[PDB]
């Protein structure tokens, strides 16, 4: 089990760790989060009590280094930092644990939610979507725009998701205009899977990372990316059977985890009704269609 210590909590803040969250009062004695499961990426995120604007946070993998949080009063935010001095870190953590000034990553043993939301998400791919190579962890916030959004303005602070555009020369083979636009299998299987992502795991990892950024930060461009990647599969007549079965599982756990009161902004009516009821794969997502119908029957 790993730990992310906090130097202090000088400003009142709601802290998130994966799908959990807790309130920390201004100058409350809080020195971090312990018992974080090894083997998964994680996200630690923040919403100030004073400015619920800008949710922000950090994607990290404790196997890649010792990370801590420290408030910066100049830039006005909780910053993730790496401690290279391993004995300094072990010593700080042990003191904070001995004084029981840490909250425990509160995982129920039966609960595979986080695994199921991050199954294909790798730190190395996160770091290519979020470019800041001097750090092993990746900052994301509510306002960051995607590379595709920038085409339609600071490139250093962008989410470099894979550009998907259904009315693009990349998506449409000369002479198969109608064929490729109505059946996007070429674009999914040849252009994106074989060509760009290399395999369906990398595709699913970007899909899951886009969902998580949409959910935890209300990041609009991420939500667009998540729906585009769903739609590209559902609108392909020819999809490997294992991809469809896994997609159904992926979306099931995303829909299960979504806050009941955010579905109005995070779920695109057109994509979901098209995907579940008109698309080639309308019959292939049984788990996802059942949870969607029982939990968001209005959207449909």
């Amino acid at each position: 089990m790993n730990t992310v210590p906090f130097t202090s909590a000088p400003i009142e803040v709601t802290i998130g760790i994966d799908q959990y969250s807790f309130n920390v009062k201004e100058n409350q004695p809080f020195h971090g989060i312990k018992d974080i499961p090894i083997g998964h990426v994680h996200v630690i995120h923040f919403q100030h009590a004073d400015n619920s604007s800008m949710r922000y946070g950090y994607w990290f993998d404790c196997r890649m280094g010792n990370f801590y949080i420290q408030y910066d009063p100049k830039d006005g935010l909780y910053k993730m930092m790496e401690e290279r001095d391993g004995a300094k870190f072990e010593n700080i953590v042990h003191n904070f644990k001995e004084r029981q000034m840490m909250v425990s990553y509160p995982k129920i043993d039966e609960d595979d939610t986080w695994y199921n939301l991050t199954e294909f998400v790798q730190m190395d791919k996160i770091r290519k979507i979020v470019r800041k190579d001097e750090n092993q962890f990746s900052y994301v916030d509510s306002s960051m725009t995607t590379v595709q959004e920038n085409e339609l303005s600071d490139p250093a602070h962008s989410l470099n998701y894979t550009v998907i555009n259904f009315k693009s020369r990349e998506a449409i083979r000369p002479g198969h205009e109608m064929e490729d636009f109505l059946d996007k299998s070429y674009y999914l299987n040849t252009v994106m899977l074989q060509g760009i992502f290399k395999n369906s795991s990398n595709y699913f990892g970007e899909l899951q990372f886009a969902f998580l950024n949409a959910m935890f930060f209300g990041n609009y461009g991420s939500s667009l990316q998540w729906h585009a990647m769903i739609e590209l599969i559902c609108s392909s007549a020819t999809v490997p059977k294992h991809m469809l079965d896994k997609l159904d599982e992926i979306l099931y756990y995303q829909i299960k985890t979504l806050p009941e009161q955010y579905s109005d902004i995070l779920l695109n009516e057109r994509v979901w009704n098209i995907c579940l009821y008109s698309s080639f794969q309308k019959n292939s997502l049984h788990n996802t269609e059942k949870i969607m119908e029982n939990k968001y029957p209005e959207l449909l």
Binding site: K167, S168, R169, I172, E177, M178, F181
Partner: protein
């Protein structure tokens, strides 16, 4: 964006543009089978592609052979339309290609956009106007050349005849749309009006009779009456 009443005069500026109407591309007769089921039989159709400033009608005839062995023909028809419009643009030299293509039905936007990805600088636009171009097959010479075609064929007509020698584009387009609106509301009456007077002939390469200016004013007045009337005869007013 959408062409409408507000930006109407843009049609007559010096930016090359084409209207595309696909209404008459896929045309069928519906009939009973010997077993008493219903079937369709396709007949020849046409794409109506019109430069409204110059009067150029690029009539692409759609021969029934293009539907052989195909499914979902109403959907194919929109993509076939887009394919032929794209081929037309590509055939043209650069300075003669359109800057905008205005489609009369919104369902043509995505098929034409996709076929024109090679031309990102050509704007593909819808319109809110309810233009009467479906009635093009009520023009005898156009209907005749479509029905006689035995293969795919592009036929060229000036839909304004020689009008532009005496009137402006704007006025010529208004005359055309009035004639077509009339033909669409009551084809029989409309055609009676146009041909009532035997002395007024149609020139070999024209579509409409050789009216004098004063005769056009009378004709135009009669077409308005017809359209107003059929509006009563339809709504009882």
């Amino acid at each position: 964006g959408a062409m409408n009443s507000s930006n109407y005069a843009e049609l007559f500026n010096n930016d090359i543009k084409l209207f595309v109407d696909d209404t008459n591309v896929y045309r069928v007769t519906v009939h009973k089978t010997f077993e008493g089921n219903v079937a369709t039989k396709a007949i020849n159709g046409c794409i109506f592609t019109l430069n409204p400033k110059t009067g150029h009608l690029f009539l692409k005839i759609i021969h029934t052979s293009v539907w052989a062995g195909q499914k979902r023909l109403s959907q194919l028809a929109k993509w076939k339309t887009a394919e032929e419009v794209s081929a037309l643009v590509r055939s043209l030299p650069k300075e003669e290609q359109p800057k905008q293509i205005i489609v009369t039905r919104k369902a043509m936007l995505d098929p034409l956009e996709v076929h024109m990805l090679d031309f990102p600088n050509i704007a593909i636009r819808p319109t809110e106007l309810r233009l009467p171009f479906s009635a093009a097959m009520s023009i005898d010479k156009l209907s005749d050349v479509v029905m006689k075609a035995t293969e795919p064929q592009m036929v060229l007509f000036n839909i304004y005849d020689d009008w532009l020698d005496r009137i402006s584009s704007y006025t010529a387009f208004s005359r055309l749309t009035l004639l077509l609106r009339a033909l669409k509301t009551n084809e029989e009456s409309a055609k009676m009006i146009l041909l009532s007077d035997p002395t007024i002939t149609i020139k070999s390469y024209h579509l409409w009779p050789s009216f004098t200016d004063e005769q056009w004013i009378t004709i135009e007045s009669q077409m308005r009456d017809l359209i107003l009337t059929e509006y009563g005869r339809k709504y009882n007013v």
